[PDB]
Structure 1
Amino acid sequence: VKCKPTSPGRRHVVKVVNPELHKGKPFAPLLEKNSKSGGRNNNGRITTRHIGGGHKQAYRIVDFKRNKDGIPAVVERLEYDPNRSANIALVLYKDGERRYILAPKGLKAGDQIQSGVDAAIKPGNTLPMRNIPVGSTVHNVEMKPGKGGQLARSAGTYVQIVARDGAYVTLRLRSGEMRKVEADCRATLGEVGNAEHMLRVLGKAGAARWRGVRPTVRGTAMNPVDHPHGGGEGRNFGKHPVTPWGVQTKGKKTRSNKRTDKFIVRR
C-alpha cells in the first residue's frame, strides 16, 4: 500500500488472504432506487461466451449523465455497490432530489458538488469538456454529448485531456491511447473511485471466486473435440486457440463508423 487507509490482510489460519473493506460509510443498508437484476449468462437458448454463474446478487442502483444542473448537491453518504468497485456516494439537492453518482476521491461529509456549465472545478459534478481547462483528471465522459458512458469503472480509472484542444475533440483514456470525442460532451471532472479498492486478492476460489463466476479455466483438458486441441500422451504441441480465434494477438475491430481515434502504439 501507500495511502490511507491500508487494506487489512487476513492471517494464516485457514488458507486465507487479502479481503476488502472501507473506512466506513455508516449504515449497512441502502435506499430504494434499484431494480431486480437478471440472472445468468445464456442467450435465449445457448450458453454464449462460456463462464458465468454463482449466486448472491440483486441491487441495481443508478444515475449517470447528470441532466440536472446548477442546483447544489450535498453528499449524503458513501455506499458500496455490487459487481462494480467504484463506491457510489448518495447526494441530495437543494430541492429534496436524490441521484447517486460515482463516488470520487475526496468526498464523504457533505461537500460542494455542482453540475451545469460554469461550476466549481473540484470533483463535484459533470461539466461540458468545453468548460474545462486541461482536465489532467476529468472522469466518465461520453462518446456523445448526451449519455454518460465511457469509463464508469471509476475505480482508479482516469482520463487526461490536452489543455486546450480545438476542433471540439480530445481525451486520453488509460490504455486506450489517444482518441478524440465530441467536445459538446461533459465530464464529472472529479475522476476517482479509490484504487486500493482493487488491490486485494480474492483469496482462494470458492468464498472469493465462485461468489461471482464459474471455473473460467479449461486449458487444454485434451479431448480433440471439446476444444481445437487435445489428446496427446500428456502434452500440447501446436496451436491452442478456441474456434480458430488465433490467440496470437491478431487484433480486430475494422472499418465501420468510429475508428477515427488517434495515436495508439504497439509497444
Structure 2
Amino acid sequence: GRVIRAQRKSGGIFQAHTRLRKGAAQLRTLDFAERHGYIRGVVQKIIHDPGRGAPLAKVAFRNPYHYRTDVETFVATEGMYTGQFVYCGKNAALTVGNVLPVGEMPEGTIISNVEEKAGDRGALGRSSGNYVIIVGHDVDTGKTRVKLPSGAKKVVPSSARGVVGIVAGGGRIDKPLLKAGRAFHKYRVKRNCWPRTRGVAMNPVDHPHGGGNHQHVGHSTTVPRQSAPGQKVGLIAARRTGLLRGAA
C-alpha cells in the first residue's frame, strides 16, 4: 500500500504556523519571591494570539536581583484590564488574575493555567473559557485534588501555581463557523489539517477504508488499542459507540 495521511503528519508540511505568535504563555519561573512572599507586576498589554482563542496578557515585573524589567506572557483571565496590578506568590491575595500556589487556595475555587508540577509554568485549563476547580486538599504528603475541564480528577503537589479566575475569550464554540472560508481562515494560522478527506472516498492503496464499489468501510471502525501505524484509523480503542441517552 501507501503511507497514510495520519502517518505523514509527522512534521514538515504539518508543522505549526508560529510566525505571528507573540510568545509562549508560561506563567513565570518559581523563584524565592513567589515561594516565600508575593511579587507585584503591572499588566501593560492585552493582545490577540493568532491560532489561540484566548487573549494573552503582557505583564511587566521588576527583577529582584538586577536593575531590569521582565515582561511575561500570562494567559489573560476574563476581567483583566490593562494597567492593573497582578500579584504572584504564596502571600498573594485571592483576587482574579493573581497567581497563588494551589495548596494555599480554599476548596472549590476557580483557577486557570494550573501547573501539573511545581515549576511547570502552567499546563491545565489554558484554553478560552476553561478553568480548573480545586476539589480538596490533603496536608499529609501535601497533595491537592482538582477537577479538570474534561471532568477528570487530578492530584497535584500542593505547591503548583494557578491563576484565579476563568480564561478570557468566553464561549467561542457557540457561534457557527457558517462558511468553509471561516474554517479555512481559522486553521490557516494554526496548521495544515484542513480540509479533511474521508477514508471511504479514497483508494485501497491510500486508506484502509478506501476501495469498493460503494463507499463503505467494510470492517469495523473500532480498532484495537495496540494497532500498528497505518491501520490505527477510525475509532481507536472505543469503549462504546453510538448515540447515548443518559449516563454519568
Q: TM-score, normalised by structure 1?
A: 0.66
Q: Which of the numbers 210, 214, 231 marks the counterpart of 2:211?
A: 231
Partner of 2:131: 158
State whether structure 2 residue 70 is matched by structure 1 residue 97.
yes
C-alpha separation between the residues in 1 aligned to 2:75 and 2:18? 22
State whether structure 2 residue 218 is matched by structure 1 residue 250.
no
What SS class does the counterpart of residue 209 from structure 1 fall into?
helix
Q: How many correspondences in the alignment? A: 211
Which range moved further: 184-193 or 159-168? 159-168
Identity of aligned residues (%): 32
Gaps of at least 5 residues in structure 1 are 1-41, 253-265
- Report the Cα offset of residue 171 of structure 1: 0.9
C-alpha separation between the residues in 2 aligned to 1:220 and 1:49? 25
Q: Which of the numbers 64, 71, 77 marks the counterpart of 2:26?
A: 64
Which range moved further: 234-243 or 165-174? 234-243
Q: Identify, as 1 or 2, the structure richer in helix.
A: 2
C-alpha separation between the residues in 1 aligned to 2:112 and 2:173? 18
Counterparts in 2 of 1:226 and 1:50: CA distance versus 1, 3 Å: farther
Counterparts in 2 of 1:129 and 1:206: CA distance versus 1, 3 Å: same
Partner amino acid, structure 2, of 1:228:
P
C-alpha separation between the residues in 2 aligned to 1:57 and 1:145? 30
- Report the Cα offset of residue 138 of structure 1: 1.4
C-alpha separation between the residues in 1 aligned to 2:56 and 2:18? 20
Counterparts in 2 of 1:135 and 1:97: CA distance versus 1, 3 Å: farther
State whether structure 2 residue 181 is matched by structure 1 residue 202.
no
Partner amino acid, structure 2, of 1:230:
G
Counterparts in 2 of 1:108 and 1:198: CA distance versus 1, 3 Å: farther
Contact 1:71 1:114 in 2 (8 A): yes
Q: TM-score, normalised by structure 2?
A: 0.70
Gaps of at least 5 residues in structure 2 are 64-68, 224-228, 240-246
Q: Identify, as 1 or 2, the structure richer in strand.
A: 2
Partner of 1:48: 10
- Report the Cα offset of residue 226 of structure 1: 1.0
Contact 1:145 1:184 in 2 (8 A): yes
Q: Which of the numbers 161, 164, 180 marks the counterpart of 1:186?
A: 161
C-alpha separation between the residues in 2 aligned to 1:248 and 1:62? 33
- Report the Cα offset of residue 192 of structure 1: 1.8
Partner of 2:93: 120
What SS class does the counterpart of residue 73 from structure 1 fall into?
strand
